[PDB]
Design a protein around this ligand. Structure first.
Ligand SMILES: NC(=O)C1=CN([C@@H]2O[C@H](COP(=O)(O)OP(=O)(O)OC[C@H]3O[C@@H](n4cnc5c(N)ncnc54)[C@H](OP(=O)(O)O)[C@@H]3O)[C@@H](O)[C@H]2O)C=CC1
Ligand SMILES: NC(=O)C1=CN([C@@H]2O[C@H](COP(=O)(O)OP(=O)(O)OC[C@H]3O[C@@H](n4cnc5c(N)ncnc54)[C@H](OP(=O)(O)O)[C@@H]3O)[C@@H](O)[C@H]2O)C=CC1
Lengths: 254, 254
């Protein structure tokens, strides 16, 4: 089967690892990030490793509603189908209960949560046409346990888990699965940030972070991509509405 | 103790029942709804029953940010304190995954979820001054199990549960409790609506609704107010960050 997968925010980190892995598994790829050079560099990496691969680059801000429509129109025109969606867009600027404001909170809501929901809407239309879809929402662990320095991102994570569940029920009769993948601590540029964004006090801030992880280490982007890829496979046909963490045991709650 | 309680959306339904009950328990009351005549009628009811009561009416749209600031400035000026907040504002227009749009979803987010969070921010400032607060968020059961015809309201409920938890951790050292009260099916004008808003097919639509309730009946506004009032009492000083349903057993999930 020649399945087609759309992976956004794929120029680095979790998105890039998912792209490389889906390529290794012979998916036709549509890939996206904002920076054109950086996402092109990924298509090169894939081609270099898989010269016979099919990879289409659609750069652009996936948080922007009109861009989203445009990227999905291009997908339908140039692909004719869509089998897999990887929803992967960063949350908003960190905020707290004390400093949150309606403007920033509104922007955070629209830029991740609304974007995912809209992307699912447009992806699912294509997916229904061939009665097959796999949707993996990259969300996060703040959804169950917030979240002091991520006040709005935590509540938006909870919203997204709740919406994905709802959507999964609606899309299930069409053989479209909808699952959430919640990374814990994964070594990307966003985590290497955190190691500093907290160093605010004193590299051995990571020994501190790793302590709270039962596995006692930060996970790799590929460890996260292994889960995404399994969820995207045809054999994961009876798994939907799930929230699955790749967090080395970090969630102490069932 | 002469505690002061602010109850919004108090002109009918759950809010009105909470107001009457807090009055029976000798709280000083600030009460609000949009319709001036209707909320005044409630102050009359209270006075008629408790001639020596203290009841201040502050009409206005609590979803409106500037009104909120104004109502809270009036509370600080005319009350000098605030001990109890009852967050009680309806959700947005019902929507579905299929018909949801960024405009309406944004309005729903701002009108309930942001409003509660902002109200908590302004109420907590007053509460900190006397090291006592009780905050009861009237939310809903759609937060754990959505929610087909309430797509955005369900995810906003999940957001609110997540935010309340976060806030409860922050406000706990100040002896301010923060709990969510999730009504299931409660006989108000909003439910009597639903009995029709679903009659779309065929009063015996209620026999249908009641079937899904283990107690086999819809609850009363006073049954809901009994829980709110207990949470608002001084003796509930060690209960915070809770989500408690008054739903006749309707939640089948733990
Ligand atoms: N510990 C962790 O890594 C955790 C990660 N997550 C979540 O996992 C997801 C990915 O995380 P992570 O790998 O660390 O992210 P990264 O910051 O490492 O990279 C994000 C990628 O997305 C691209 N991107 C950013 N904004 C947009 C946009 N508006 N439209 C399209 N592409 C965009 C970036 O490229 P470019 O700038 O070129 O657009 C970049 O390639 C995020 O949603 C994050 O919230 C959740 C919890 C923990
Ligand atoms: N089965 C049920 O009743 C359920 C209820 N809930 C929740 O419980 C809460 C109360 O429900 P319910 O009693 O049925 O609501 P009602 O529709 O019966 O009444 C709501 C009250 O709030 C007032 N109000 C509405 N909008 C505003 C506003 N923007 N600012 C200030 N006041 C307002 C209304 O008066 P006025 O128009 O004069 O302003 C009215 O008095 C809601 O948040 C609802 O979401 C959740 C699940 C189930």
């Amino acid at each position: 089967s020649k399945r087609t997968a759309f992976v956004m925010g794929a120029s680095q980190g979790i998105g890039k690892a998912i792209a490389l892995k889906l390529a290794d598994q012979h998916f036709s790829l549509v890939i996206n990030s904002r920076n054109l050079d950086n996402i092109e560099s990924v298509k090169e990496d894939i081609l270099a490793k898989h010269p016979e691969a099919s990879v289409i680059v659609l750069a652009g801000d996936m948080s922007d509603q009109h861009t989203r429509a445009g990227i999905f129109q291009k997908i339908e025109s140039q692909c004719g189908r869509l089998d897999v969606l990887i929803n992967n867009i960063p949350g908003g600027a960190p905020d707290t209960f004390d400093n949150c404001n309606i403007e920033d909170m509104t922007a955070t809501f629209t830029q991740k949560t609304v974007a995912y929901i809209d992307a699912i809407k447009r992806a699912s239309s294509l997916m229904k046409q061939n009665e097959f879809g796999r949707i993996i929402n990259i969300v996060g662990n703040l959804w169950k346990e917030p979240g002091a320095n991520m006040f709005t991102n935590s509540m938006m994570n909870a919203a997204l888990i709740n919406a994905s569940k709802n959507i999964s029920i609606q899309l299930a009769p069409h053989n479209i699965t909808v699952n959430c993948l919640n990374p814990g601590f994964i070594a990307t540029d966003r985590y290497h940030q955190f190691v500093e964004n907290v160093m605010k006090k004193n590299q051995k801030a990571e020994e501190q972070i790793a302590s709270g992880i039962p596995m006692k280490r930060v996970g790799s982007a590929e460890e996260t991509a292994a889960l995404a890829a399994f969820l995207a496979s045809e054999e994961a046909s009876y798994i939907t509405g799930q929230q699955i963490s790749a967090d080395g045991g970090s969630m102490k709650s069932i």
